[PDB]
């Protein structure tokens, strides 16, 4: 499909999309567990991260948005994790990815800055990180509502 990830197309430079959906996330996985999981192989390679929590059902939504700074970092993540089991909470689910319909850190910021999710516990809010320079990967304060 239009959102399937093909590592060879990324390597050859014919698909430069950077926003990816991390799929089949176990119900009880947290955003901290996801950040740590990604940091095993991809620390400092992404500049947007969000795993939405459903507070009523005590679970995450099952997928996360991640914006990689360089499209090549999708190969690093994918080749290490895609097709492997999460191996937490006795889940049978496997890590998988596809491209998101929304593309880029700026579009992601604009999608959540005015959202009601910014009113929840600061620890569970979407995150942005420095995209370039010596501090690349360091968390940045999320921009305030545009209204």
Numbering used by the authors: 580 to 726
List sentences from the manuscript:
Upon meiosis onset, Mmi1 is lured by a ribonucleoprotein (RNP) complex, composed of the nucleocytoplasmic shuttling RNA-binding protein Mei2 and the DSR-containing lncRNA meiRNA, that accumulates in a single nuclear body overlapping the meiRNA-encoding sme2 + gene. Both Mei2 and meiRNA are essential for the assembly of this structure and the completion of sexual differentiation. Interestingly, Mei2 mutants lacking the RRM3 domain (residues 592 to 750, hereafter called RRM3Mei2) failed to accumulate meiotic mRNAs, suggesting that Mei2 RNA-binding activity is required to inhibit Mmi1 function. In this study, we show that the RNA-binding activities of Mmi1 and Mei2 are crucial for their mutual control during mitosis and further identify a lncRNA, termed mamRNA, as a major regulatory and bridging partner for both proteins in the nucleus.
To gain insights into RNA recognition by RRM3Mei2, we solved its crystal structure, which revealed a unique organization as the classical RRM fold is extended by the N-terminal helix α0 and by one helix and two strands at the C-terminal extremity. Using isothermal titration calorimetry (ITC) and size exclusion chromatography coupled to multi-angle laser light scattering (SEC-MALLS), we found that RRM3Mei2 tightly interacts with a poly-U15 in a 1:1 stoichiometry.
